[PDB]
Design a protein around this ligand. Sequence first.
Ligand SMILES: Cc1cc2nc3c(=O)[nH]c(=O)nc-3n(C[C@H](O)[C@H](O)[C@H](O)COP(=O)(O)OP(=O)(O)OC[C@H]3O[C@@H](n4cnc5c(N)ncnc54)[C@H](O)[C@@H]3O)c2cc1C=O
Length: 577
Amino acid sequence: ATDGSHFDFVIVGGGTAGNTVAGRLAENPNVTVLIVEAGIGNPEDIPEITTPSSAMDLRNSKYDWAYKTTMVRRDDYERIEKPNTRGKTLGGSSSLNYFTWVPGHKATFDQWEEFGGKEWTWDPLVPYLRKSATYHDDPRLYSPELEKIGGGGPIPISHAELIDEMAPFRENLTKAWKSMGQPLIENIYDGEMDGLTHCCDTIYRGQRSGSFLFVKNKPNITIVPEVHSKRLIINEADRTCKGVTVVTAAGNELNFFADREVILSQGVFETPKLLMLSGIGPTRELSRHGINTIVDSRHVGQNLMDHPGVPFVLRVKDGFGMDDVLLRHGPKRDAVVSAYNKNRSGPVGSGLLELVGFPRIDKYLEKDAEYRKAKAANGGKDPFSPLGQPHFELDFVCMFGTAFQWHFPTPKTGDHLTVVVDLVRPISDPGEVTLNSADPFQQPNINLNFFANDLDIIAMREGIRFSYDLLFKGEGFKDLVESEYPWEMPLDSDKEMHRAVLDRCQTAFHPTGTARLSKNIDQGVVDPKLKVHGIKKLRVADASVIPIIPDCKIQNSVYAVGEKCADMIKAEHKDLY
Ligand SMILES: Cc1cc2nc3c(=O)[nH]c(=O)nc-3n(C[C@H](O)[C@H](O)[C@H](O)COP(=O)(O)OP(=O)(O)OC[C@H]3O[C@@H](n4cnc5c(N)ncnc54)[C@H](O)[C@@H]3O)c2cc1C=O
């Protein structure tokens, strides 16, 4: 690509929303679209990217930004971790995520109206939540009604391609779930999600469905990988964004210009950073690093919101986890690896997560005096999910998961279940993404501020207790549990649970909100059309725009944001669409 080139649209960051916006805008083959991306351009060529069972091994790989981020910052406890995994490749974090495809609760999306007006509520957003996907049910295992969740887009999705050997696992987990009086549910896509479900995945035929599927075989898309953004090109007199400056592998600075619009899609952490490096952010934060303020945008990098998770591992009877097939080397692994290389069948093509629970835990919360005081203090409404939303997403990963055990060694023997207790409706104040310096090659400073509010600790403790009650007492599954790893979860002591939750928690990998959609610059940084407040020809389309975090894994809302962004761009450029 030649220095100084003009394109109709420039997408900065070839990630999840970025490739969505780019591929959609290229559907007029006459429209020129450029994508600049820090990582490789050929992820479909990388077996670890395309193979679903390899997803966790991508942590700390060359495709992981591997940021340091502060998980918790309380007066009694603070912890910083590395890596906070983020995709560094075309496809962004959709090239290394764990595939689950779930929208979230209608009541939550309706509340986005406070930020985006009526067009950002559940009903208008449903088509955008489905437009990216083509649904498949090859083994004809699920209700025909659910083909509605795919609108026909280039991301193939399916219910998990079930591992045959895990069917006893699945059958005892289901029995245990029902034995605790909690519903089963398969249609979690119409605004309601109460119960245990067979999840859908961005996996089809044993292959990962990443956002790069949007931007291939489209000659009007110029893809420039391996370039690192320096700054957006802003004209102050015009108050207009003209393009972007990037740095190449050889250390050369290139300017690419957009003749219509630039769309910033660098994800929740680098989008606020690049905005700030370009003169759009909190004015004193900018001054403190020698950056001129073009627009005093107080919310840039603020309102970082994520889900905390406390994972825990149980060792289970042999044959009720996949550790011995996929994790440990030997004939069993060689066998399924051999089958995969010939036709991409077998469990090597599995994302290892097939049942997911979305419970409320009201009866656990009610046993805590502090929760009772707080609910009464909120006028009798549950502080976490006052509109009936789930309290947790419980991922039952059917193997020891290194990506959820950041400080314990991998067990040398045995089969395991990794339960990821994900608090999806926390009430802690948000964190922030701040600049370390004006250096584009340094990571922003990242504070997730998990568990700022003690009530989130109480909730997370009870979500662990719920999960333990389910697996140790529930019918059928109670017989499968051999031991706890690496030691007993101290559920008999509230005070020990306090320490355990803080010390064992991690990100569930759903950061949002750092450039949020809003009605004005005093509320957020982009408007309901995703235009940056105070700047012409600049939109943001990624997780940083999300104003209230969905009640589940978030890749579905992030694709929807990209789809809607492209539609609102097309509607404005009528001479092109
Ligand atoms: C472990 C992991 C596990 C999960 N698990 C599941 C899952 O199971 N299901 C689910 O729904 N969500 C999952 N998620 C959340 C879900 O994946 C995430 O929320 C969405 O994928 C987020 O979608 P954006 O579009 O908002 O952000 P993006 O990062 O994709 O794209 C940004 C792009 O910009 C480029 N880029 C950045 N900076 C520069 C720069 N300086 N110069 C030049 N280029 C730069 C950068 O290289 C990248 O290409 C999971 C993510 C992680 C891990 O990140």
